Amino acid sequence: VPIQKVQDDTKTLIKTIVTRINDISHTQSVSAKQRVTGLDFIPGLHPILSLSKMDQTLAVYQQVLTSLPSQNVLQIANDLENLRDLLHLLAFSKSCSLPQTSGLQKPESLDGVLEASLYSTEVVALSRLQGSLQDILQQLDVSPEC
Amino acid sequence: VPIQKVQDDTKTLIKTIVTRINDISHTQSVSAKQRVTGLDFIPGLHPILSLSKMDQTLAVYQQVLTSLPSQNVLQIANDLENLRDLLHLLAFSKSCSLPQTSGLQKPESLDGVLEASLYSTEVVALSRLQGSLQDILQQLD
Amino acid sequence: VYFPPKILTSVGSNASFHCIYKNENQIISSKQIVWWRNLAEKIPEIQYSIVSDRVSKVTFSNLKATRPRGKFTYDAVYCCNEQACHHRYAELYVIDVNINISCETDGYLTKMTCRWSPSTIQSLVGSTVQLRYHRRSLYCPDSPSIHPTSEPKNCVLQRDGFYECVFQPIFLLSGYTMWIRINHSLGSLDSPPTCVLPDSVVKPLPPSNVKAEITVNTGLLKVSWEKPVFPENNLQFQIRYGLSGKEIQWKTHEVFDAKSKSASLLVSDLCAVYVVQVRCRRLDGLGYWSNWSSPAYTLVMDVKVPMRGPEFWRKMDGDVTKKERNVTLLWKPLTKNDSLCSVRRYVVKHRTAHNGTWSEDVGNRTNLTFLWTEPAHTVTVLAVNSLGASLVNFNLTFSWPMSKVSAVESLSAYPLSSSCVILSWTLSPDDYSLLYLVIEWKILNEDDGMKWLRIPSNVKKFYIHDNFIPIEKYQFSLYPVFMEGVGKPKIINGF
Amino acid sequence: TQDVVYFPPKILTSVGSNASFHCIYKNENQIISSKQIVWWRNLAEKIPEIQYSIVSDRVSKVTFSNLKATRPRGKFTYDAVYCCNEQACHHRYAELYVIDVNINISCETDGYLTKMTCRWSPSTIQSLVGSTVQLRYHRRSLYCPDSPSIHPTSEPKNCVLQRDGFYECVFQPIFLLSGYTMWIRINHSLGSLDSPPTCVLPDSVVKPLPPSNVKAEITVNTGLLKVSWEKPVFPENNLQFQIRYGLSGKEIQWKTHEVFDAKSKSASLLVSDLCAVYVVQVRCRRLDGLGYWSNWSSPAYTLVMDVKVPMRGPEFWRKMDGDVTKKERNVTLLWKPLTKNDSLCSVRRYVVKHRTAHNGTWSEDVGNRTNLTFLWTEPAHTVTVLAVNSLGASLVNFNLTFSWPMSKVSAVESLSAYPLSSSCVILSWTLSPDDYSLLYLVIEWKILNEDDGMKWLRIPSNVKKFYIHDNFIPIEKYQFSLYPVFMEGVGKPKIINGF
């Protein structure tokens, strides 16, 4: 499989996930000013540059999403695991080996914060994932490092 | 009833019977050259001449058909008994007063081969009775 | 003595058999065994084999589907000595297994719907069907294969005779290897495996917000539509358009540009209602075509003004001694070529030396009656639609001095038949600026069977086609026309 | 007891049957003498005295005969007969129920000889409330008996009413030659009644399937439609076939015919037209008359084919295009399509054969065109137009020759035109006394100054006066040309302009 086709498919999945996040966000009209403490475990909007960090932060987001009781969020997590598969495929295409991000311990704060606010955590996680995923789409255009 | 009508009606019946066996046996075309064991009690290997032999043989064909569970075969057995009644009346018309002794069947091999070789039983029965019907057709004149 | 007594296999394989013939208390050699199927065909010796002196082996090849023979679903094969056959036999079963599976992706990318029909299975009673699948996280391989780890799928037989299989939620980029599993009392078989990628079978939603319009002053059928939501927006669009009526003569146009939201098409008639529908599929051609969009209907507006003002003629009622004479203007509705789409109102313009010019909106009427008093009066009828009046309009000037001018020298009428009459005339040699000539005719003593026709001044011989009754007397009048007004007409009665 | 005693009180009987009642009328405390008692039916019809019978001084009897079916009267399905002292009718009555036992039995046997179906109409049983319908049949070993009768032992059989309002029930398996005696049995609180039983032989009510593999064609040389078919497999007895044929269109005016020889699987019938498409259907039934017609066959369409070579060649003429001084002259041959009689069915192509003394003879295929233009260069040139269908050219064809030397031979002496009307003009002429072997004459006319008002007519050489029927306009000037035609070519024509 040509590397260009893999990159195009990854961009397709980026666009589709951004679209579905927008679709659920339209149904969830939440003020962005709601500052909820204890959410430091969700990756922040920071410059993400190399593919290893892509896989790591996406696995973190998927673990956060998997804990949400929403079925659409579950299918989003399915899309995230598929996108990790394609990120690893891109890693093989560039002769780089992403570390197997299977050792992320389940965040102990998930149980304490989801019970406090399932809905607000879902909203903020979706927003931060969407922003990070546009960050990825921009980086994928500029040949991100390993 | 006049005898000529009896005769022509019998001819019509027997040719209907052979046409029916032909139009059913088309799906079961067989080679008469092959001989099977255990079916000696099914006749048809000899020419048929006299009244009593016809009656006994057709009673045998009756009983062997009755053992077979097919609706078409049910109608065939019905027609066989019809033509047996016809031949009994024809014998009465021949002005021969011979006592009518019929029956005398010992069909346990019938049951064994029935539970053994259903397909073989039906095909050999139809073929042999078909041949016997043509032979008695020639003998009829 | 048979081994084995019954065999299961599918179309396209070989076969092998073993027989031991037992007669009385003796066993014959295998060199005399004669094989037969259905007691009707002697199997060629080349298919036979002698593995042992007492065992006869027969091998088949490329076995074909069996044709049902009454209640039986199998054929009986017989291993016989010479012509002596044992009553026992074997059993064979073939069954067709090649079954096609039809799947579609919903337009909302939530569910997988697979369908298939058990028609080939209907001939077997006692057989139980189960659908077995294995999903690959990667894409489908070139050669689908039955994976050892398979899963059962529940499918509902619909009224159509097809089983429908609903899978949800979905994984578009995951390969889905599929094959049918049948389970009879004698065992189980499998259909040829197939793998389907959900992305490749997407049927998009029908296009939305289909708006049809004929662009003004151009006559181009412009359509605007809203694109249904799709990944990459890589959609190939198909537009069908046709006349609005009992039968829509649908014409089609394709829009290759996936970025195009509106397009314009030429139409022959600018004044007809049209029906347009749009369907879309993936730009690469994969998946299905979407449902045809809702029909958009064009509204009949006036794209342009009428092209020519109606041709009109006057009727003179009023005594000759009277200077004031009422004038009745007679014109006709514009044709669809002249009215374009419609004529909304008739406005008759006037021209005088003293009162100057003015116009009278006659409305939808094709007649306007007015009094004539001034020596010089020019008139002109205009046809006005929603966009304005017509461009080219006929003028007609009335003059007292010019009416006394006699420009027609001779006149002759010749009836060709009840359907045609020849008109003959000779002009005066004077250099009259004849614009044209008006043949004006009616039945004598009839004041309402009135007819007239303009002809160019260059014509010398003219033919009139009408229902002419020879008994009736016809009055014929030809009028010379100029800048200043009409000259003195030539009038004859009869032929 | 009661003041009025009807014994038996209620009676059920059939049409035409005889029934009788008895009354004992008590008025107040006195029993009315039987001689003072009058009967009344539904209190609307007094029963006549002649039917009165006296059992005793207190018991009087009336015996209805040849009874007719009771007409339902609103909610009353019975005829109420009243025991009346003269005019004193007591409010109670006896109820008489009369039904028509004549229920026709319609039976059918399929062409497969495996299903027996029968129907009957319940058209009279509605007038009996609470009546239970049942079919009872009995099988005779062989044949139906001479006089049908109800067997003491019979077998009930359920039958179903369909939307047609008829009762439906069948038999399977069936006895081919066993008499079936059946009847309709009714059951009610007043007893049971039976229809007059009829016996049916299953073999006499058999109708077959339509005969298949019917083919139709037109005989090329004779002209009779050739049709072949195949008898249905069952029944095997000799059958008679009826054949119907007609034209193709919205309506078909069929014509009927029958064949009696069963052995004949082919037929031939006279026709009126050959080049149209006919439709034909056949049906079969037993020769003796037993059974029924087998509906009809599927419609069949014939194929139009050129039956024979065209019967005559087309009549043709020529147009001179070329100066008199020029020796080479264009010759535009002009003819018309063959009529249905002349073309028979079709003319596939026009082949114009030529003949010269130098180039011999050759033919030109003009296709479907009715005109042909060629240059005249030889002094002698014979031309013959051939109409060719699929089978070949036409048998006898018209010949025309062109010759420079005899083109100066003037054979026509006079030429006069007389207009009868706008629709007819007389042509009159006198001939030269020379012994000219004139084949025929050609009348060629046009409107003067009109180059496309070409019209022409060939007329026999023996004619001396001719009448032309065409739309003539007296105003227009007409040029008239009469051409003397000989074996060697066409002679010098005579030309006049106008009348």
Numbering used by the authors:
A (entry chain D): 22 to 167
B (entry chain C): 1 to 141
C (entry chain A): 332 to 826
D (entry chain B): 328 to 826
Original paper wording:
Activation of LepR in turn drives the phosphorylation and activation of the transcription factor Signal Transducer and Activator of Transcription 3 (STAT3), which drives production of anorexigenic peptides that suppress food intake and increase energy expenditure. The structure reveals an asymmetric architecture in which a single leptin induces LepR dimerization via two distinct receptor-binding sites.
Analysis of the resulting molecular model of the 2:2 leptin–LepR complex unexpectedly revealed an asymmetric, partially open conformation in which one leptin simultaneously binds both LepR chains, whereas the second leptin engages only a single LepR subunit. Consistent with previous mutagenesis studies, the high affinity leptin–LepR interaction, referred to as “site 2,” is formed by the hinge of the LepR CHR2 (domains D4–D5), which engages helices A and C of leptin. The low affinity site 3 interface by contrast is formed by the immunoglobulin (Ig) domain of LepR (D3), which interacts with the top of leptin helix D and loop AB. Notably, the canonical “site 1” interface, which participates in high affinity receptor binding in most cytokine receptor complexes, is unoccupied in the leptin–LepR complex. Surprisingly, our cryo-EM data reveal that a partially open, asymmetric 2:2 complex in which only one leptin forms a site 3 contact with LepR is the most stable dimer conformation in solution. In our dataset, no symmetric 2:2 particle classes were observed.
